[PDB]
Amino acid sequence: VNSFSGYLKLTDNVYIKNADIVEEAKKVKPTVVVNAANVYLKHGGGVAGALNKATNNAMQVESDDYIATNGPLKVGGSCVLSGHNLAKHCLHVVGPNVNKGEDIQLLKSAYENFNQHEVLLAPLLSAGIFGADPIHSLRVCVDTVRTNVYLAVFDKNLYDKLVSSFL
Numbered sequence: 001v002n003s004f005s006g007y008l009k010l011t012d013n014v015y016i017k018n019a020d021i022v023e024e025a026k027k028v029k030p031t032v033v034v035n036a037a038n039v040y041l042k043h044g045g046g047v048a049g050a051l052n053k054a055t056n057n058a059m060q061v062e063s064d065d066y067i068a069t070n071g072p073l074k075v076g077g078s079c080v081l082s083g084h085n086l087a088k089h090c091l092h093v094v095g096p097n098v099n100k101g102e103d104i105q106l107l108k109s110a111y112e113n114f115n116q117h118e119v120l121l122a123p124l125l126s127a128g129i130f131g132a133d134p135i136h137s138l139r140v141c142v143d144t145v146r147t148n149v150y151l152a153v154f155d156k157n158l159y160d161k162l163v164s165s166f167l
């Protein structure tokens with residue numbers, strides 16, 4: 001049994017809810033929240049900016065030190081950093097950004113990072129300002145992630161479309 005509440009069941013391991021991811025993290029304090037990161041861990045907009053703002057910029061300070069030491073992530077890759085006030089850990093995952101011309105086949109590689117964690121709170125990778133089709137992102141998620149994933153969809157309209165169209 002876990003703390004996640006109100007989630008619509010999709011499969012054996014994937015759950016979905018219309019939720020503000022900052023607000024969900026603040027309430028649950030999950031072991032792992034996933035950030036929709038870029039390779040530079042520059043948390044300007046979307047989920048990354050929202051999450052970072054909720055940490056009072058401490059996520060960005062930590063991220064800048066990580067990049068200064070390790071250099072950029074790979075598209076499809078990830079790193080584990082602090083969850084600050086939101087979670088125990090933040091898994092920063094880089095899905096391909098269609099608005100930069102990145103290979104959408106890298107979306108499966110991105111989701112494979114989730115399998116290293118038994119339970120996660122996450123957004124749909126490569127959705128929103130990353131430019132991918134969220135219906136596609138949900139399909140790749142269900143077909144790739146084997147661990148227990150609780151997906152927070154920001155748009156109520158999109159949430160309803162994802163549920164209604166789910167095979």
Ligand SMILES: O=C(O)c1cnc2ccccc2c1
Nearest residue numbers: 020021022046047050128154
């Ligand atoms: O899911 C997103 O794309 C997203 C974008 N903006 C946000 C702003 C505040 C809180 C959550 C957000 C989530």
